[PDB]
Design a protein around this ligand. Structure first.
Ligand SMILES: [Zn+2]
Ligand SMILES: [Zn+2]
Length: 66
């Protein structure tokens, strides 16, 4: 999960400069729901674990709502 990296490509957290993943609707420190305004970078490229869970989550969530 979003443990932390030197060159993050997600969104920055105001409550703390942790910067979580772009596809992570919630900081792993403050738990502040990602701002809908924020967008995900096309060149994101989620890790093997990130995509493994993301691709599946959206397959059950996105497929429903979106
Ligand atoms: Zn936050
Ligand atoms: Zn935070």
């Amino acid at each position: 999960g979003p443990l932390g990296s030197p060159e993050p490509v997600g969104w920055q957290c105001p409550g703390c400069t942790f910067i979580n993943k772009p596809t992570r609707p919630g900081c792993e420190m403050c738990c502040r729901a990602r701002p809908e305004t924020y967008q995900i970078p096309a060149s994101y490229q989620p890790d093997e674990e990130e995509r493994a869970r993301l691709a599946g989550e959206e397959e059950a969530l996105r497929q429903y709502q979106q």
